[PDB]
Amino acid sequence: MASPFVETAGTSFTLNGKEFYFAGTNNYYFHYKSKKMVDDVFEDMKAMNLKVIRIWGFLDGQPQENTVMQPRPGIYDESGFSKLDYAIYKAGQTGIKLVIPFVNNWDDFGGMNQYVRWFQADGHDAFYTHPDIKEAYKNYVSYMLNRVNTYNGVKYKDDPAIMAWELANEPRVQSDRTGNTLVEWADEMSEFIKSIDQNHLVAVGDEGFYHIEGHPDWHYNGGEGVDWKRLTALKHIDYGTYHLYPDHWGKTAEWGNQWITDHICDGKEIGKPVVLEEYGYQDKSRRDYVYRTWLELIEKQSGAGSQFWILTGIQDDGTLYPDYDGFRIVYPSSAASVISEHAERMNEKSAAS
């Protein structure tokens, strides 16, 4: 049956009775910036033919620009939640879908380490195993899923503007070389979400690292506690996520080509969609060619979609929000045109499905 919620069928997504191949993006500031700044990014997405944006669903502990979502365990604050409500509302108005992780692996916006601090634990990876922290995470998830959006009266778990919930942004368990800890946690937390929300997709939000047995030279494939094939195969996970930052990781753009091909292939073998959920390349003089090449693999090998890091827009004074991290894409630009030409082909593929 046709559904207004994004669903899966084999290695691709579906939406409203048609296949849903997409290009999209990420932005971390929708839960604390003005409506003018948020609206400008949505407007850029429409101009770029983008259909999906991944945004943070967390702001734990310390406020950012006087805005917070969970200042203390179980204390849920309207300053950040009202802004998330607005993003969901605006996505619904504009026909864009959201992907929303519940916690950060990293310390930006508090992260797992804020839970470790609140609960008096002894290090990052306690987040995954301590019952007190797991229950706090569950209480936060359950609050979000059940929250009534103040802009439209629709509970988050009932809103088709949300494509997927995500367990975390880039979860790692460096102290666990087996990958068992994250698989067990992800199994528990995806089951929990599905026990409440029977409308939405769920993904892990991991970076896609493989578990290579022994002691591989490239420590990311085993040493970060991430076993992507096992995570993607979990019963209550609907699609696999993989990220790509070859510069950071000591790799090349051509290694990135092979990384994309390998993850798309593994989606075909597992039988679930896979999304290149974050990607970026730091040399701006080569990124247009690098992105073109990566996105053409996505298109030609039938990957379900991709989301670049990062689309930012204007600030309240009309100037551009700065390129703080070296990954900024603005619209219009030569990199935005590479992406928007690919996005148009993905949207045409969907319409012709």
Side-chain angles (χ1 to χ4, degrees), residues 2-17 19-281 283-333 335-353:
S3 176
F5 294 94
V6 181
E7 294 177 348
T8 65
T11 59
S12 55
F13 295 110
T14 64
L15 178 58
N16 297 311
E19 308 198 297
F20 183 61
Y21 292 96
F22 63 86
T25 190
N26 291 258
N27 181 291
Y28 60 75
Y29 65 58
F30 279 19
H31 65 332
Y32 66 99
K33 291 293 197 190
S34 67
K35 292 176 182 172
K36 172 175 175 170
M37 287 187 61
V38 169
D39 289 347
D40 189 65
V41 174
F42 278 101
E43 175 179 355
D44 287 348
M45 289 184 70
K46 172 185 161 82
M48 294 179 62
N49 317 301
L50 305 177
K51 297 285 184 172
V52 178
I53 186 170
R54 180 162 174 271
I55 64 172
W56 299 161
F58 48 82
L59 218 174
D60 291 305
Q62 282 325 110
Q64 175 82 21
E65 297 176 22
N66 300 122
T67 306
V68 68
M69 293 175 76
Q70 188 178 206
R72 295 176 304 287
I75 306 305
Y76 308 129
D77 196 287
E78 292 299 304
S79 64
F81 272 101
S82 66
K83 291 176 172 305
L84 182 58
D85 286 352
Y86 179 74
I88 294 157
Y89 168 81
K90 179 64 176 184
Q93 290 181 309
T94 56
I96 283 164
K97 307 300 188 276
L98 304 179
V99 172
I100 304 173
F102 289 119
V103 69
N104 207 350
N105 188 66
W106 311 114
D107 289 354
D108 307 289
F109 311 103
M112 292 173 187
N113 279 328
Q114 179 64 67
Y115 285 82
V116 168
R117 184 157 47 259
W118 281 325
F119 291 95
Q120 287 93 29
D122 191 54
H124 179 272
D125 294 345
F127 172 85
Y128 299 102
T129 58
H130 286 207
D132 52 2
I133 297 176
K134 285 196 290 174
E135 172 67 9
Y137 173 87
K138 287 176 166 176
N139 285 336
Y140 182 69
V141 167
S142 183
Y143 174 77
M144 289 197 60
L145 293 176
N146 284 291
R147 177 180 168 87
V148 178
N149 186 323
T150 61
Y151 283 87
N152 62 17
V154 176
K155 288 174 191 181
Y156 283 15
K157 68 188 178 177
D158 295 328
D159 198 314
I162 299 165
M163 163 173 168
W165 302 114
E166 203 153 73
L167 301 187
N169 175 47
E170 303 193 327
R172 296 182 178 185
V173 195
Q174 295 202 161
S175 64
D176 178 31
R177 314 201 61 249
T178 70
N180 292 346
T181 293
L182 187 52
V183 167
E184 287 163 9
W185 180 84
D187 196 21
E188 176 173 356
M189 301 305 182
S190 60
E191 185 176 335
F192 179 77
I193 295 159
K194 289 292 185 166
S195 77
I196 294 163
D197 180 336
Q198 276 293 294
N199 293 316
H200 288 115
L201 300 179
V202 178
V204 178
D206 68 283
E207 295 158 276
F209 304 129
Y210 293 111
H211 182 87
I212 305 299
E213 185 51 68
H215 272 78
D217 279 1
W218 190 62
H219 292 5
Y220 287 93
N221 272 349
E224 297 305 330
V226 174
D227 182 338
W228 174 81
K229 286 183 178 177
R230 268 206 291 168
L231 286 167
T232 302
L234 284 170
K235 176 150 78 178
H236 301 292
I237 294 298
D238 298 298
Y239 69 95
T241 52
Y242 61 110
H243 298 192
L244 174 54
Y245 291 96
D247 300 305
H248 281 188
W249 294 345
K251 298 294 199 176
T252 63
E254 292 73 23
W255 177 94
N257 299 344
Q258 183 74 54
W259 176 254
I260 296 169
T261 289
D262 288 354
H263 286 83
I264 295 175
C265 283
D266 291 342
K268 290 183 158 70
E269 299 202 22
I270 293 162
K272 293 185 184 180
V274 301
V275 176
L276 176 57
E277 156 167 275
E278 295 183 22
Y279 65 90
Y281 192 75
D283 180 354
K284 289 198 195 249
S285 78
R286 300 214 176 166
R287 89 191 169 154
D288 290 357
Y289 171 79
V290 168
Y291 293 172
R292 183 185 300 115
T293 301
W294 288 348
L295 295 176
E296 180 70 351
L297 291 166
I298 299 278
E299 201 206 312
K300 287 301 94 206
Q301 302 178 340
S302 293
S306 69
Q307 305 179 242
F308 63 95
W309 180 278
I310 181 174
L311 181 59
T312 58
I314 71 180
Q315 304 194 89
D316 291 306
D317 69 359
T319 70
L320 289 174
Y321 183 83
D323 186 10
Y324 290 126
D325 71 357
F327 293 118
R328 181 181 68 178
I329 306 296
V330 301
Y331 170 78
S333 67
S337 291
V338 170
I339 296 160
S340 65
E341 290 155 12
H342 163 77
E344 192 75 281
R345 292 191 285 271
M346 295 292 267
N347 297 341
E348 285 157 353
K349 183 193 323 220
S350 302
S353 78

